[PDB]
Write an enzyme that holds these catalytic residues in place. Structure first.
Site, PDB file in Angstrom:
ATOM      1  N   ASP A  27       0.838  -1.193   0.000  1.00  0.00           N
ATOM      2  CA  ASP A  27       0.000   0.000   0.000  1.00  0.00           C
ATOM      3  C   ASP A  27       0.874   1.245   0.000  1.00  0.00           C
ATOM      4  O   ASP A  27       1.900   1.291   0.688  1.00  0.00           O
ATOM      5  CB  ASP A  27      -0.938   0.017   1.208  1.00  0.00           C
ATOM      6  CG  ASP A  27      -1.824   1.246   1.240  1.00  0.00           C
ATOM      7  OD1 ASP A  27      -2.713   1.365   0.372  1.00  0.00           O
ATOM      8  OD2 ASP A  27      -1.624   2.100   2.126  1.00  0.00           O
TER       9      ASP A  27
ATOM     10  N   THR B  48      -3.453   6.153  -2.707  1.00  0.00           N
ATOM     11  CA  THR B  48      -2.340   5.842  -1.822  1.00  0.00           C
ATOM     12  C   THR B  48      -1.058   5.741  -2.625  1.00  0.00           C
ATOM     13  O   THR B  48      -0.069   6.413  -2.319  1.00  0.00           O
ATOM     14  CB  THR B  48      -2.576   4.520  -1.096  1.00  0.00           C
ATOM     15  OG1 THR B  48      -2.568   3.450  -2.049  1.00  0.00           O
ATOM     16  CG2 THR B  48      -3.915   4.528  -0.404  1.00  0.00           C
ATOM     17  N   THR B  49      -1.076   4.899  -3.660  1.00  0.00           N
ATOM     18  CA  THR B  49       0.047   4.747  -4.572  1.00  0.00           C
ATOM     19  C   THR B  49       0.058   5.808  -5.669  1.00  0.00           C
ATOM     20  O   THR B  49       1.127   6.282  -6.069  1.00  0.00           O
ATOM     21  CB  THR B  49       0.023   3.346  -5.188  1.00  0.00           C
ATOM     22  OG1 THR B  49      -1.236   3.130  -5.835  1.00  0.00           O
ATOM     23  CG2 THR B  49       0.238   2.283  -4.126  1.00  0.00           C
TER      24      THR B  49
END
Lengths: 510, 513, 534
Positions: free
Chosen positions: C57, C90-91
């Site tokens: 994550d 998130t990424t």
């Protein structure tokens, strides 16, 4: 070993290690070569022409190494070039990739008395069924695309793009003027370097083509007694200027007297030696020039050994210094001699046409030699591959398209046999991918991708990679039904010869 | 903070510590066995058959030195075998496939590879898994004496063949599922200090060391009644919480005895009511418990409701608030057998219980104190087959040969499979054949050419059934030879090994946090 | 850092603290790239020599990471705050967020005035905002061939373990449409929170049993009171009956054990009296949330009783809401003489319970306050259902994410790598410093797939070969349709024609990250007067 003394460059660790190591590392060239490639090697033997090459022979000519195998093994690789021009950029990488396959088995502890056998045994099994996977043959050698097809693997193997016209040009050269009945000659059909024009303009002018200038006249008769002389005219006694103006108005004459009347008797006995063409390894003096024209003797102002050698070779000549009335032990070979403009350059053309002793000569036109040599290299290795002296080349699938064919032959046969050689034979079923990788490398993919998709084609014979987009993702160029084909001859050799190298080189401990 | 570690180098870090563990206990594995010496910094001798035991006792690296304990502990929790096998498969395969494949540039088709070389592995395993009968302790023998000798014990094996082979059949999950495969609760391993093989009785039920500890505690009422509190005792073991001050010295003592007096007044109520048994789960200390011995009662203390309520169903007891209170029998007699076989005066209650939830404590006696743990591991190594055979009558003869049967047939399917797939497939399939050839090492002679012929023999004649044994290093029928490789074992030992493979293949970085 | 090291604190005196931030931005982005999505490999995050964790994550690592760089500071929160936005990004933000602050300040410094370059990283994102909101083109679950069924299927067939997409083409439809509840995000949306789904062990390895109404979780052997009478009505109870302790406490203040049992035994019988009133009112089955201990079980075994106890409140809640019953309409007390009410009666065609797999559920058939279905996942083990359920939830979620937005965007960077050369040519459109400004971002819509397919080891230069094969002058087109396939399916590494799969994300999650993309850029600019503190 246990001594301060004795000797070795090999053994122990080293035999298992150094003898396998650098012999492989030699392959980096052949790892990037043999089959279409843009990848090249600038090799400077310091000639002031910085030589592009993929050809292993003249790559290995400079390379020198203490590893006795790698020291030796270039022999079998060069012994290869003797036998076939193409397949030589194949030789070094195949065994080289096939080598450390055994060394991994040596890490497994599979003996030198063992492993190489299976290779040798599958070297049989190859050359057993290797003639079975022969498909076509190059039959009519006057024909262009039976010759240019063999050429279309071979020059292609060396270099990619230029190949096609070369193959034409080489087949248009008709190296079949040599009936290829058991007849082929590298000097009679020769490369003649011409600075400029095009390399598409690079042609084959039959005869002996000398870019050196025909000086004054041409031959008195076309069957010449050909005067090939290293120094027929160096000058006899030269003129001088003393005062940075003149030396003396009186001293001028006596030296021309010695010059003329000698070069009189010189070239008169170049006429009395019966020379129809005088071929001067050195320069010419304008007096002898005048004499060469009066005495009716075709004059060549300067000659490289490139002339003089082939002259000695073809004409039966001996290139000679002359301050004296000569005699011809040269005579002629030639039935024709000319000044022709080839490369659109005034050229010394010695000529005749036969089956045997016949000079039908490539004339290469290129801005440099690095153009006209490495391409010639690319060229002649097809010309060399044209040399079989079995007129039908027994053309296998070209472009190494027989790899996948023998690969499943050897790996299935490696399954058959038991014992540690079954691995070695299955290891022999491996190094096939080297050139398919060597292609896929200069093409830019891994052979796995290639060869696994060509493990999906199973029995195919046609599809194999190269340098091209087809060789990257599709893993496919059609190298049997192509126009790109290769003889069984180099197939008989490279698989066996690179093995013959790899045979004892692990055995050699000292 | 700000730090970045990369891929194949982290994969190599995953390769390194594991690759070391893959060796000695692989040699320690199987009929050709070794020991792993551990030098203490003071020089103390340590050698085991488990390298994770050596790891726990020495430096453990954050890479798979940590994980190859973990996933083997994962392997230790499930079937209780193959931990030695998992450490030596995982780091090996991760040392084998990756470099060959990552130079082809991919974890990706290697990601698929391990479960593909798992696929045929699991596949043809179950297919060549030979049915071995559950009803016979003898036809459960050759497989379980094989399993207990996977860790090289024939010592208590046959005796673990006696007790445990029918015991897992007597293990019932009260979900009324399997049962056959049993996690260790309903089946436990608990031992009695000292004793003898006849002081070992086949014990298929719970064993309470606390049911009869002492002779004045209950003696052979074949169906006791375990009273939990609530009337005969109560929910208070309390403290009256007396006011305190510095001027009262007697005041410190009264609050100390008050914890016991409530423990006493409940046991005094037990003295009044007098069951045959009371289970005090809050527990009773020494004082009030000495008062239950004059009342002709056992005091079962500080055990659990789960065990008791199972003990109740197991020993024939039940929870009733008073002995004088009589409601009904949920189990009139829940015991297969009731035993107390004492070592010394301290009593140990063996209640043999057939298909009860119970504990299925399988009485395991070494000749003395020390080899008890042997009989424990053996009766534990026993129940592995016992839950395997009862689940799966099929289990592969092999483990030299099953390891061959897997390996050679795997790449043999690359002949069917091919594709780009075959390359990581075989590469993750490569390392497996070496396990017997690693043991065929200590067979002497040629560890290679034997398996080579055996690899030929694999598809030639038969694979795991007829194949290589660690005892032989050569072809025998592992059935005819009686060497068996439980089906539940191979489904796991490789899995957790290839589970750690793709993972440590996919874990490409270690941050500082 | 880099530059003068003798003045700490983000004075590197010049671009040395700009570059040490952008090279840290690039470095802090290096964490998340190979972490990007599931194809991004799980990192094993050392928290200490004895403490690690394994996550791919983007926002999980960076919450754990320390960042004393300002550009490394803005990157962690952007992974986190866009996670705080959605969890998509998130990424995603991280990769270009390294670039844009590296892309922003360069021309900002060049100033004709710094205000000009600020929009360049907003403008293309704004032009991505439209393009992203212009996407119904891929991710639309509502428009299938089977509609919701294939929206189920293709989203199931994305996470497919099995026959997911066969019976599970039905279930994600069944699951979202078994839900009558007031949770709504924007346009009407049906909770996948309220789906009642339970696991089966044995029988079919993969099957989904579709049962009418809510099926209450129950088990045999944990209750000695026989709980089963065939009827049309249930009694949903927030309530308890325990013979040990119901209204009873303990006494440590009282010395007499007689005091505990005297008030204890009264509560044991009134349990048997209360069951009579809960039964005889309307209900032959009475569903009780409050439980009984295994000891208390014995007390209810040998003293006898009737009730269905220890049942999940969440269902008994949803059942009474579904079945027209009431969870508690009556009891302000636990007493046995307290009467029971008929409003808590479940309104149902029948009260039936199918025990199967050795797993029993209480089937409430024809729940009359609203429709319901409790779908029984058939595994041979219970964790087979999670593989389904994990395939289900995201299938549930992506359809629910299409229940979030009509306009919906393709997974993978064929959305970005399209505008990439579109807007990097739009750099040239305005030219000047804006051709620098606009390209710096629009060169960077190339890089996300260069991370994406390479996480699948596809060499995304081969993907952008396939991407910009779609991405044309002839196709500049998000449209709502595909004359170019704008989908990039990240379970593969190359585009697949699924628009209903569970990998795709709604337009809500993206235009967010567009701010976040530009957010690392100009957030760090507004400072003046770099100094040193003693």
């Amino acid at each position: 070993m246990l001594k301060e003394g004795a000797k070795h460059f090999s053994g122990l660790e080293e035999a298992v290690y150094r003898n396998i190591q650098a012999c492989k590392e030699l392959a980096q060239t052949t790892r990037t070569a043999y089959g279409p490639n843009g990848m090249n090697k600038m090799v400077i033997n310091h000639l002031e022409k910085l030589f592009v090459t993929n050809d292993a022979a003249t790559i290995l000519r400079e390379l020198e190494v203490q590893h006795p195998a790698a020291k030796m093994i270039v022999m079998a690789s060069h012994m290869q070039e003797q036998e076939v021009g193409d397949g030589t950029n194949f030789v070094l990488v195949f065994a080289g990739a096939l080598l450390e396959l055994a060394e991994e088995l040596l890490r497994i502890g599979l003996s030198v008395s063992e492993v190489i056998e299976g290779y040798e045994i599958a070297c049989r099994k190859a050359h057993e069924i290797l003639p079975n996977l022969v498909c076509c043959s190059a039959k009519n050698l006057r024909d262009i695309d039976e010759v240019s097809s063999l050429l279309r693997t071979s020059i292609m193997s060396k270099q990619y793009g230029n190949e096609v016209f070369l193959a034409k040009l080489i087949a248009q050269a008709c190296v079949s003027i040599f009936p290829d009945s058991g007849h082929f000659n590298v000097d009679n059909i020769r490369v003649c370097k011409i600075l400029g024009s095009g390399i598409s303009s690079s042609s084959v002018l039959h005869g002996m083509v000398f870019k050196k200038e025909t000086e004054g006249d041409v031959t008195s008769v076309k069957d010449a007694k050909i005067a090939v002389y290293s120094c027929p005219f160096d000058g006899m006694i030269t003129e001088t200027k003393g005062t940075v103006l003149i030396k003396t108005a009186e001293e001028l004459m006596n030296f021309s007297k010695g010059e003329e009347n000698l070069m009189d008797a010189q070239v008169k006995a170049i006429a009395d030696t019966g020379a129809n063409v005088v071929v001067t390894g050195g320069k010419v003096a304008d007096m002898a020039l005048h004499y060469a024209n009066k005495y009716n003797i075709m004059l060549v102002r300067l000659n490289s050994k490139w002339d003089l050698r082939r002259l000695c070779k073809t004409v039966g000549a001996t290139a000679l210094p002359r301050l004296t009335p000569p005699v011809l032990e040269e005579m002629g070979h030639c039935d024709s001699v000319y000044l022709s403009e080839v490369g659109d350059t005034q050229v010394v053309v010695f000529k005749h046409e036969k089956e045997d002793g016949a000079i039908s000569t490539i004339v290469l036109r290129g801005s440099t030699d690095n153009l006209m040599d490495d391409i010639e290299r690319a060229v002649d290795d097809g010309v060399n591959t044209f040399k079989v002296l079995t007129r039908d080349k027994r053309l296998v699938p070209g472009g190494g398209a027989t790899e996948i064919e023998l690969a499943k032959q050897i790996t299935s046969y490696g399954e058959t046999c038991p014992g540690l050689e079954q691995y070695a034979i299955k290891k022999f079923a491996e190094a096939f991918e080297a050139i398919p990788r060597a292609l896929a490398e200069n093409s830019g993919v891994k052979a796995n991708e290639v060869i696994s998709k060509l493990y999906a084609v199973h029995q195919e014979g046609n599809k194999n990679v190269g340098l091209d987009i087809e060789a990257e993702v599709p893993a496919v160029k059609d190298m049997l039904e192509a126009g790109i084909l290769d003889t069984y001859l180099g197939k008989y050799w490279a698989i066996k010869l690179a093995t013959n190298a790899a045979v004892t080189v692990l055995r050699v401990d000292q | 903070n700000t730090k970045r570690e990369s891929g194949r180098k982290v994969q190599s870090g995953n390769i390194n510590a594991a690759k070391t563990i893959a060796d000695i206990i692989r040699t320690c594995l199987g009929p050709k066995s070794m020991m792993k010496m551990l030098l203490d910094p003071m020089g103390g001798i340590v050698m085991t058959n488990d390298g994770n035991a050596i790891l726990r006792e020495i430096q453990v690296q954050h890479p798979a030195a940590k994980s190859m304990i973990e996933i083997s502990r994962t392997q230790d929790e499930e079937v209780g075998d193959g931990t030695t096998s998992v450490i030596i498969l995982a780091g090996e395969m991760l040392s084998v496939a990756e470099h060959f494949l990552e130079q082809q540039m991919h974890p990706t088709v290697v990601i698929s590879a391990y479960r593909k070389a798992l696929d045929d592995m699991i596949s043809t395993l179950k297919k060549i898994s030979i049915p071995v009968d559950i009803s016979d302790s003898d036809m459960m023998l050759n497989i379980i004496n094989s399993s207990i000798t996977t860790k090289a014990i024939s010592r208590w094996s046959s005796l673990a063949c006696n007790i445990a082979l029918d015991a897992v059949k007597m293990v019932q999950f009260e979900e009324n599922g399997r049962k056959e495969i049993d996690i260790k609760k309903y089946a436990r391993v608990e031992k009695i200090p000292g004793g003898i093989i006849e002081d070992s009785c086949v014990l298929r039920g719970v064993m309470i060391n606390k049911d009869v500890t002492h002779p004045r505690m209950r003696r052979y009422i074949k169906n006791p009644r375990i009273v939990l509190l609530d009337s005969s005792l109560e929910y208070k073991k309390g403290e009256s919480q007396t006011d305190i001050e510095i001027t009262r010295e007697e005041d410190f003592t009264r609050i100390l005895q008050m914890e016991e007096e409530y423990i006493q007044q409940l046991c005094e109520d037990i003295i009044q009511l007098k069951p045959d048994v009371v289970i005090t789960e809050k527990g009773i200390s020494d004082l009030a418990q000495h008062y239950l011995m004059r009342a002709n009662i056992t005091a079962i203390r500080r055990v659990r409701k789960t065990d008791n309520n199972r003990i109740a169903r197991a020993c024939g007891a039940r929870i009733v608030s008073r002995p004088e209170e009589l409601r009904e029998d949920d189990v009139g007699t829940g015991a297969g057998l009731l035993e107390i076989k004492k070592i010394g005066d301290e009593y140990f209650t063996f209640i043999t219980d057939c298909k009860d939830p119970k504990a299925c404590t399988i009485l395991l006696r070494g000749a003395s104190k020390e080899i008890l743990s042997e009989v424990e591991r053996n009766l534990q190594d026993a129940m592995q087959v016992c839950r395997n055979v009862l689940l799966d009558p099929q289990l592969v003869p092999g483990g030299g040969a099953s390891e061959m049967a897997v390996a050679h047939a795997l790449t043999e399917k690359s002949k069917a499979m091919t594709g780009v797939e075959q390359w990581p497939y075989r590469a993750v399939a490569q390392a497996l054949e070496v396990i017997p050839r690693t043991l065929i090492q200590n067979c002497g002679a040629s560890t290679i050419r034997l398996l080579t012929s055996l690899r030929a023999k694999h598809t030639q004649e038969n694979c795991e059934t007829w194949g290589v044994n660690g005892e032989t290093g050569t072809l025998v029928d592992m059935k005819e030879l009686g060497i068996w490789e439980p089906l539940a074992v191979k489904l796991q030992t490789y899995k957790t090994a290839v589970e750690t493979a793709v993972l440590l293949l996919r874990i490409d970085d270690i941050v500082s946090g | 850092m880099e530059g003068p090291l003798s003045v700490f604190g983000d004075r590197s005196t010049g671009e040395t603290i700009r570059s040490q931030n952008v090279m840290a931005a690039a470095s802090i982005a290096n964490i998340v790239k190979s972490s990007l999505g599931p194809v991004g490999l799980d990192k094993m995050l050392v928290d200490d020599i004895g403490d690690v964790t394994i996550t791919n994550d983007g926002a999980t690592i960076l919450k754990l990471l320390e960042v004393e760089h300002p550009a490394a500071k803005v990157l962690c929160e952007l992974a986190d705050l866009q996670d705080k936005e959605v969890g998509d990004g998130t990424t995603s933000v991280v990769i270009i967020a390294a670039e844009l602050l590296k892309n922003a300040d360069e021309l900002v410094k060049q100033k004709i005035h710094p205000t000009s370059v600020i929009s360049g990283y907003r403008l293309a994102c704004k032009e991505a905002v439209r393009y992203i909101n212009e996407n119904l083109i891929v991710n639309t679950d509502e428009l299938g061939r089977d509609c919701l069924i294939n929206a189920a299927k293709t989203s199931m067939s994305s996470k497919i373990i099995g026959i997911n997409g066969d019976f599970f083409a039905n279930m994600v439809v069944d699951a979202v449409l078994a839900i009558k509840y007031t949770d709504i995000r924007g346009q009407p949306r049906y909770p996948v929170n309220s789906v009642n789904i339970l696991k089966a062990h044995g029988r079919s390895q993969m099957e989904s049993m579709l049962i009418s109404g809510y099926a209450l979780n129950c088990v045999v052997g944990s209750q000695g009171m026989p709980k089963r009478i065939v009827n049309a009505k249930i009694a949903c109870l927030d309530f308890s009956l325990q013979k040990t302790k119901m209204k009873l406490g303990v006494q440590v203040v009282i010395t007499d054990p007689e005091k505990l049992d005297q008030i204890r035994q009264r509560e044991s019988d009134i349990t048997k009296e209360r069951i009579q009133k809960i039964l005889a009112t309307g209900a032959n089955v009475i569903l009780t949330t409050g439980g009984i201990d295994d000891m208390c079980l014995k007390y209810f075994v040998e003293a006898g009783a009737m009730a269905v106890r220890r049942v999940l409140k969440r269902d008994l809640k949803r059942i009474a809401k579904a079945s027209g019953a009431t969870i508690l309409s009556t009891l302000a007390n636990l007493e046995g003489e307290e009467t029971f009410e008929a409003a808590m009666l479940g309104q149902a065609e029948e009260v039936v319970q199918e025990r199967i797999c050795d797993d029993e559920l209480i089937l409430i058939k024809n729940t009359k306050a609203r429709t319901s279905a409790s779908i029984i996942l058939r595994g041979a083990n219970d964790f087979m259902c999670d593989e389904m359920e994990r395939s289900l939830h995201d299938a549930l979620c992506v359809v629910k994410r299409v229940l979030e937005s009509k306009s919906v965007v393709p997974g993978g960077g064929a959305v970005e790598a399209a505008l990439s050369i579109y807007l990097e040519n739009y750099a040239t459109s305005m030219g000047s410093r804006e051709q620098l400004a606009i390209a710096e971002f629009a060169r960077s819509l190339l890089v996300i797939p260069n991370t994406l397919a390479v996480n699948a080891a596809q060499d995304s230069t081969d993907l952008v070969a396939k991407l910009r094969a779609f991405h044309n002058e002839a196709q500049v087109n998000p449209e709502r349709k595909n004359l170019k396939w704008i989908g990039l399916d990240l379970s593969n590494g190359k585009p697949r024609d699924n628009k209903q799969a569970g990998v795709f994300e709604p337009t809500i999650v993206k235009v967010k990250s567009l701010k976040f993309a530009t957010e690392a850029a100009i957030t760090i600019l507004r400072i003046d007067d770099l100094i040193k503190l003693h």
